[PDB]
Amino acid sequence: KEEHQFLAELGLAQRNPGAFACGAWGGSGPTVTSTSPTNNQVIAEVVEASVHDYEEGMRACFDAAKTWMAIPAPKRGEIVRQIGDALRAKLHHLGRLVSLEMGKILPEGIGEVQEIIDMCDYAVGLSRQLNGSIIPSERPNHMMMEVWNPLGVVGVITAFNFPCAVLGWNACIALVCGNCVVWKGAPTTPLITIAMTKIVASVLEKNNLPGAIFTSFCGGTEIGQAIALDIRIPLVSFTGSTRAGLMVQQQVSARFGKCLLELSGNNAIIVMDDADIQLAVRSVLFAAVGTAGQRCTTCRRLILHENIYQTFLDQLVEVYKQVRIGDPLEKGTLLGPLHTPASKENFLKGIQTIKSQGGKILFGGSAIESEGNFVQPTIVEITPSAPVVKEELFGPVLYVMKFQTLKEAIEINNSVPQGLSSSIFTKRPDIIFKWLGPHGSDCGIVNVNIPTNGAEIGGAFGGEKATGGGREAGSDSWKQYMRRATCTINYGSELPLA
Amino acid sequence: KEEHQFLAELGLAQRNPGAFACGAWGGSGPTVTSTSPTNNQVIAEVVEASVHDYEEGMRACFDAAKTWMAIPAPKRGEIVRQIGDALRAKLHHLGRLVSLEMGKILPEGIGEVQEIIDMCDYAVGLSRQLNGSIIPSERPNHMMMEVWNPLGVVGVITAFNFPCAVLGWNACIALVCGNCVVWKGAPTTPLITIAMTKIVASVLEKNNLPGAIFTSFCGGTEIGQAIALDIRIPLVSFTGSTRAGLMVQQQVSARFGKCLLELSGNNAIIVMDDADIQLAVRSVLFAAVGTAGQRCTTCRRLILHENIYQTFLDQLVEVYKQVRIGDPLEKGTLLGPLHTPASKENFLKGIQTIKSQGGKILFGGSAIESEGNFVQPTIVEITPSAPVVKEELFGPVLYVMKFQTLKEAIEINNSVPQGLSSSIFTKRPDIIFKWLGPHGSDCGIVNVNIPTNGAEIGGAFGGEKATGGGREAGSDSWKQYMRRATCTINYGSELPLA
Amino acid sequence: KEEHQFLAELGLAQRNPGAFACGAWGGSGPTVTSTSPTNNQVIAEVVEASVHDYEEGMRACFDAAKTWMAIPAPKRGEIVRQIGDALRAKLHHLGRLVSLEMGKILPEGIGEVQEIIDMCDYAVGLSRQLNGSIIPSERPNHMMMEVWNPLGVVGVITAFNFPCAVLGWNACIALVCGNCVVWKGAPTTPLITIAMTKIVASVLEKNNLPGAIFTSFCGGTEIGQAIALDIRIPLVSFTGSTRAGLMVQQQVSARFGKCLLELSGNNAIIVMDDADIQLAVRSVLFAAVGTAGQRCTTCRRLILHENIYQTFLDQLVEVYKQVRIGDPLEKGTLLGPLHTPASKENFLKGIQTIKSQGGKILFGGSAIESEGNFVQPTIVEITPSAPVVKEELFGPVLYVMKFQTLKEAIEINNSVPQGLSSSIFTKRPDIIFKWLGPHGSDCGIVNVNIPTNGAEIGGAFGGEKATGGGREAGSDSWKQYMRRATCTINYGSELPLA
Amino acid sequence: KEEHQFLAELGLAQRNPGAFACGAWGGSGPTVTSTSPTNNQVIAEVVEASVHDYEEGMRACFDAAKTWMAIPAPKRGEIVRQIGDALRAKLHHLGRLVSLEMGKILPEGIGEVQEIIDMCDYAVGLSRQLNGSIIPSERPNHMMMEVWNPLGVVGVITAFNFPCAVLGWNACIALVCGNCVVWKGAPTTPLITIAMTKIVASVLEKNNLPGAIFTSFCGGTEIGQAIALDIRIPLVSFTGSTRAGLMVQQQVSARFGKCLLELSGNNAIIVMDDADIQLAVRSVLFAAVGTAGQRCTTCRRLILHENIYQTFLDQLVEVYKQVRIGDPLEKGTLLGPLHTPASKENFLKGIQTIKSQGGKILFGGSAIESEGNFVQPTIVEITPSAPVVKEELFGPVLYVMKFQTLKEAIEINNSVPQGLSSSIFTKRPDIIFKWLGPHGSDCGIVNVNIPTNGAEIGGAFGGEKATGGGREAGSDSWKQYMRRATCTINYGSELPLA
């Protein structure tokens, strides 16, 4: 399995130290193997980080904060600007590494790095706008103001699916806001974590700044638990399951810390009878099949109107038959493999429980005979009452259910514990005003004639209910990475009444 | 113990139903006695709310939300405007009831109701500004927007010290934001809870609105626990101890709900050698003695500079000797009684543990022989290392400690788990920039030449660390009472690439 | 005439001093007669202000500013709160005076005073929100901030149509922003000017504030020219014709002053074939007939679709036949008289020039034989090419032109020099996105399925092109009444390189 | 002269077409000579633009707007991102060209281009933030919103001193805001105008966009007058004298257009007795001598405290004696030549009128015998009453006047017609609160312990009084380049009362 030469340009070797602390690479933890989901073959080896490595790096990361906080915000924005340009120079290579290690199709991965690049460009302008307020006081010779200050150290625990995009949105904002970043990437994604850190480390070194500003570790739940329990980390940004999310939240809340939660999503698309069937079918395909259904924003529930029901799914199966399943690096591939053999096993056992709950498999449902973790994109006719519908299967399974009124459609959409993304395909404005109103969708993302997956830097990305409540990317999200202080200065010689 | 006639104008009788649900007064719970802290005599009786009453009122409160959410925000602001005017008509009476039942001196109480009145006036203007955003999209024929919507039902659990001000700041914002309010007042403050509810109920009835919009209950931890566990309440605003705060937070976080925490404060005043000693002494007195030290913002720690140390405290004791201790309703009273006989017992046992930890009582420390819960205002010379300093005694005890450098002063101020309010008395601007900077105070409120207690409607009131993180009154605090939705409307016929 | 008595309740007599200069009433100018447009009979007499009176009042108004600017903004907001309550106590009487003196129907006038009261409620909250900004500096130990400060004296020149609403929007903002107000009301509306000033003067006196904070004068263009040329007045808010607007602007621009312009509006309503004809007809009637077409937002142009053309206007004439023309104080009156006999003469000569340009009068066009200034509501079939269309006639004349496509409709709407208000009546979502887009309406107010006249205090009211550019009421309009200063404080010992 | 070659690297030749109209280079106007102020020798020739060229380019620029306004704002921001990178590649060369053609020292010019590059980095983030608002309506089933739209074509008339920085601030904002830019550079700076346009044209061509988006012309007042009178240009951004500013304003106001005015500045530095004399002397030198006093922010007035008066100016003359006067391209040069021989003649005749008004020349005042336009840096002891003080001389002349109290100092600072920048050198916190307060400086820029010239892209740069009122760079300046529309959509079936 060569190259090799491709990994060397990303700064990777056969065996790699998986701990970036304190400006240098180390690792006294176990030696893990990085596998490609396309053939289940070794890309390289990673010497994981131990708690010993974590503590050594954490002592320096905390110490580096003093220096970093003192740097003016526009000057911090200039470091982030150079991070974006560093990523631009390796865009093509990082995209390939994301596809090779994670399993997502080449366009996605280039686009993932492109999302981080677009975020750096925004963070430069944002550095000039981390504004405070001068509030009028009700007392004479009193200056009242709202003051923002860095938190210190921001902990970032990321998932396998966006092995650098989640860090990108968090680190760009955290760094620009004067915070140091302690990153713990996915255990199955160590090479992307190293290559991403080497780009950041490059910029920090080029500007004579301590490498401890961007500390990173490769490992399992051990280092993750250490971050959640660390009193030196005021903010922990978690990205993963609702199961692990609550666990992290509980530990962080106990120590009076704050945490940004970006949890599981059971996203639904509602198709009204008056919808653009061509637009709706195309949208449903790319929302459900995209990243082999391993996206937080992946459409898992299809709420179909009775009038269009049959005609919609027969022309959806017709499109599902045309999905090219292959190597994510090969041109024309639409669906790649599932990240691990474990997820392939989970998908197959899920199909069995779906059948148990009365689910009728319209298309797919079977595994594909290959060296990699390949499965068929599945469409399931099921009742909304079935427990598997309220679950969250991280594979290409789409549950389709019939509805009569818009009131019953919203009832189904809001019934699930998760509240990340939702969509309606309709032409009538009365429905659009209902959908976006108080009695509409209870999600963080509410879309009209656009799928659940289409999300950009401009607006604050995040979910409600079981998806946490945390917000990323644009808007006023920066305020989560800083501390608000209400200040009042008395500059008058006037003494209080005796 | 008459009048009586004063209570009748506030709508109170000898025995009162303590449950306002569903637009009517009830109560199937136990009969509690409301005592005056000045003589420990019965004012009136309150028939508490049971879980049965809570459930009946909660079913209607949840149902009323549909109607309330549909009312335009400026029209909701008009209801709040009339609430302020209703309070203005009973300002004099409510102030007396706050003094009589809670124990705070007449000026405070009138001022407390005045704070609610000023909040209504702000909430009217705010109703016209619950603005969303139209974000530029990166895709042609796409409308991107940030949409705000009511949460539904806001739960408000209040403490004894501000028996209506805490509700006032919460309810004004919650109601204007389209939410219904379920209030559970202090168990020792039921009469203020009833009288406050009768004013709100008056306005709601006058406008043909369901009374269930403002549901209120009198009771113990039972009704409070019910609110924290209620899945129908997306936001729980808690005001009380850090002990109970964490308990409420834990229960609310488990059910994927949000909670606004306004917890305990161990507030400190730092006096620099170059300070206006006249201003600093006056400020320290009113910050420490005010409301018999039963304020969340009460100065409990005095961090004194060695150069001014002796000269400051001898002239502080000289002022402490001049504190008039009497009936809070009597003119000229500066210090009233502690809210309950239990708090008087806690104060006295605290003095004993303070002596154990090497605390040298400079002034007071003893109880006053009276029918009411009167104690002497205390000044204690103590080392910052003592455990009682990190505690929170809800009485008039001031711990004084010597410092040499501004660096050791900030070290002491930030050492405590609580982070609500802090102050510095200085004339040099280099210290002011350090104090308000990243290496300064870690509190939510950071004041210069003004005590820890002086807080107005204009700025977002709240604390950091063990004080939670929740914000009240002005600024962008309204966003906590609503849900953010990132919306994208595709209005173009353009189909995604095949 | 008697009543009389009703005038005494508003603080008016048979002969009134028309100059509120230096906290007291005076007037060395000519004696003018206030006439009722319903019968052309004398209500009372007003002793106008001379330039001598103006100068004496202007010296004190400028001097009072020192005191007023020193008052904290929330405390200034409390004065404007009290002004609203003072107006509430005389709501019924002011509405009657406005109707009697100006000629507008009783609902309007009562509604107009209510518009001012609503602005007072918003201004209280706004006083707490005149915020500055703390911008991050790119240099270490540098504090960068945006600072707002009062301008000093705000000059308000008002028109006859809104003899107190225009002042209300301006004065509420100006006063809260720390500015003194010098008011010059319309020469045909002095009694409203006096009665409005007496309410303000009442509040200012009750709070021991100099009356010079609110200076007001009754007179012609003489006092208006004096304001425009006065170097002591940094901001002149003008409300009137485009002819006088440019004159005021040119005198103010010459002396490096700023002016708020709220000029003429030749507002159009576009009716699409798919519109709710019942809604559109009702809307067109009240937009065109309302205030006898003497509103700045009055619909003067009806852009009708060919498919609905005939059917729309025959059912519009059917409705125009039902318009009750009578005493504005009499119940059921829909159309009252024109403000002066001069405006009645202008309307009649206009009808003649309309006939000259090929205008075919569908309904009305004639004067009504009575003692008052009554005219018939007119509908005119005309080509958009006609010059009279591009002009502004301040009477009930509606021009109606046929169109085929949306491009043609927008072409007509944008063709006029004025750009105040515009409306479309359609059900199509595409038309709305085009109408609100870059290629849509070029007006300050762009409405969908609502007439040109419906405007509230929540959003910034103002017009583009020949309507000036000035904004009133809500949003960020306050910034016009203050001066922005970009401040940078260097608090570091660092010296520049030698 | 040769180099030559260096010019070819910037896209310049011996003779250059000076009209970038309709995506290609032309010019039917006269042939002008570009001279170097260091020796008065020809760099190259420029074939100016005629009115014929202007009209041809203006027809296409107006036509290109349709395409440009349709491009999404984040996508427009990407073009401005690329413009910054294009400038980065030629940073070294442009700085040299600016120095060679304008006469400013090499650090400035390299610094000036860097100011543009910095603005490009901010404009990318700003493209994602040109937000509208969703205002709560007071009527049910009504959507109220604030909508921003491009103006169309922005006219930019620039001065000689910042031959590309002024365009940079304007064009970055204008382009991101969806407007086309028509640029008219200073007649004495055509080569900088061409080289700057070639960089923009490069990016526009690389992205298959019409070159007409960025139209530029070389010429005198002829093309400038054409822009001011052009009805196709809604916004004219003028940068020059107060004399030409008023002329442009009056022509633009007449046609109901808007204009951004960045006029003359007679900036003052106030030195208090308690100031850091080392900091104040260094600051005064670089503020007054910088760019040979040919900056809009150049310190022209020194307001000195009587206690420090003599000691300050003797140590200022001592520093003025050390000013290196030479070739701006030569290392170590602190003062270069004046832009033209005409400005050298104006400086010398000014010295004569200064002597007439009782001005006593402390240092300099004489011309330097060389081929270039070199003059001595001048210090003048003068009374504030002298008329020359209130004027603006565009050379290195510093007027110095004695003061006793802060009232007297502010009186002098505010006495001049111009209100751009102002500074105080003090250590007292009281003076700073007075200086930044309502009774302080009446300028747009108010600095403490930092000179009048130090201005960055974070805050809105602009002046008050005779400096216009227009704002550039950061803050909410973008709103000037777009049109605000207050929109209300009625989506309810409710009909108005018959």
Ligand SMILES: NC(=O)c1ccc[n+]([C@@H]2O[C@H](COP(=O)([O-])OP(=O)(O)OC[C@H]3O[C@@H](n4cnc5c(N)ncnc54)[C@H](O)[C@@H]3O)[C@@H](O)[C@H]2O)c1
């Ligand atoms: N803005 C603020 O931060 C703020 C304001 C006022 C008071 N306080 C804090 O209040 C404390 C003193 O007030 P207190 O003695 O009334 O507080 P407390 O914590 O004992 O109880 C306050 C309220 O919570 C209820 N409650 C108690 N335990 C509960 C539980 N487990 N679940 C649900 N409800 C429960 C009580 O019935 C009461 O209504 C101080 O620590 C003070 O700092 C804070």
